[model samples]
Target: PEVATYHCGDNLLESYDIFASLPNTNAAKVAAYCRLAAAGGVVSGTIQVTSYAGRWPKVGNSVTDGIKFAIVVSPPMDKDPRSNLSQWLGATVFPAGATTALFSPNPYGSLNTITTLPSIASDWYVPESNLVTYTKIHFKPTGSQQLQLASGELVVAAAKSPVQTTKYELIYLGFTLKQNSSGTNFFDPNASSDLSFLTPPIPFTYLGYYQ
Candidate 1:
């Protein structure tokens, strides 16, 4: 089976209890009942690396629990002066902010080279991005919630870290449930040339949140 190389945030992965039994690989499944959220770990739906990357601008709300939730991007979709003025006509919502969050060195693709983008996320303009879970990755007392009991897609989650490490963030993006969607999957590999599926490095840059 292919291995996963990314982690959502250290808050969960690097925790005292979790890190002890860490899967050592992101692709490894922790079982349907890992109860990660019960261990002071925040989670909803399923704990995964990039399962939520494609869910953009779509905010999850926490009605009761102390768990708070919010994405940092300030809904920045706009159209510039077409060609000579800008690279494309679309939105530029970063995890947190442009200057601090730093979506400057876009590895997967860049706004400076966009072409034929007629909408929010199409062939070239995918709404989801492989950015590090940038901001508000905490239990705000500030946080992010769950599915309705009736029957629906739902999740509850929170996160944190030691304020260190460069490559421990999970950036969700580009992909959706297919006609025959078996559940969820990633289109890119963390490392391709390493043979062990741990070296090529997925196309992405560091993204963070504001305190």
Candidate 2:
């Protein structure tokens, strides 16, 4: 029920989608999946978002489709000399016949931050447009805590007016993690295979205008 919106610059909105993956729990499975060492791990699991649709608040334009997003989990960096670095570790193996096509490209997340949106979104051929899809959002450990999970969401909207008004209508939603008495549910690689480590795709609300 919390309403939020974001300024999408002067870009026009388009169709979008979203998906996320977490690493496998078993180290051996991760090693075999990613071709890494026995102690190594790989982010691998799927959680899909259901339909979250509504009309743009300010402009009242229809945003029929949710913007596509990909939160590709990558391995944490090494410890630096400055401080005793606490890193967040997060995997899954792909099908054999689908190996190259699945993991060959090395999945990464990207948001529609760049002004020149068309440059990154090849499918969005229209010049006078901005499409925010396949955004890479990193789930790094918060502050000095080296926990394996964090919770948050990315909000985005389309400009109501390109030049005159500094207005934007909300369109896209971000991932929201679930928390309980024990703690929050993020992508935990050490979780059991019976339960998915990553939270299910959050059912989002469409906050109209960036007011």
Candidate 3:
């Protein structure tokens, strides 16, 4: 019997679900490790965990630590106010933050809007934790097949003052094997023919900091 394996992009939704299933602490830990590898910042206090249900602080009575910072694989058009309000209430980094800073390359248009945390003053201090960072990679299979996949990372930055503009960064931390393999376009014909080949065994790193 021939064993078959898939790439990370195969079933992105399922992969996300699996990642979501992890304990908040474990998830936060994963995020922190990614951040360190990205060379972004360090995390203080215990790892605060959040789920689709809600956020939870890692320590203290205040809800300062517990904030869900996610990567929006499929971003919605109408922005979610929770992100801004949470930042005001105290969740600094939201899924669309980086996308908000970086314009979409889509020739048609972009669905992302400027992230303006309403109700919060212009100069509020909202600390951001790197929940997950995604990097595109090419993978190869046994028969010299190639595919594209994404890796996850958890990052943390030093507590800093809040500013008007959002900053963005790309960090090449580590790699996670196929979270699931059940989707289309597992390989990019234009890119390569191999269905399982990864460059650097890790993603590239880039940072974007705004004013």
Query: Which sections of candidate 1 miss by over 4 Å?
Result: 1-98, 106-116, 119-172, 178-211
> Per-model C-alpha lDDT, please?
0.19, 0.22, 0.22
Q: Give the runs in model 3 whose Cα sits over 4 Å from its true position.
A: 1-32, 36-135, 139-176, 179-201
Per-model TM against the reference: 0.18, 0.21, 0.19
User: How do the candidates rank by lDDT, highest first?
Assistant: 3, 2, 1
The local lDDT score (0 to 100) that residue 178 gets in candidate 3 is 32
Model 2 misses residue 137 by how many Å? 19
Q: Model 1 over residues 60-92: C-alpha lDDT tens digits? A: 221221111111111111211211111111232
20: Cα error in model 2, Å:
4.2
Whose lDDT is higher: candidate 1's or candidate 3's?
A: 3
- Which candidate's lDDT is highest? 3
| Angstrom error at residue 64, model 2 | 33
Give residue 86's error in model 1 in angstroms. 20
**Candidate 1 accuracy as TM-score:** 0.18
Q: In model 2, what lDDT does residue 209 have?
A: 15
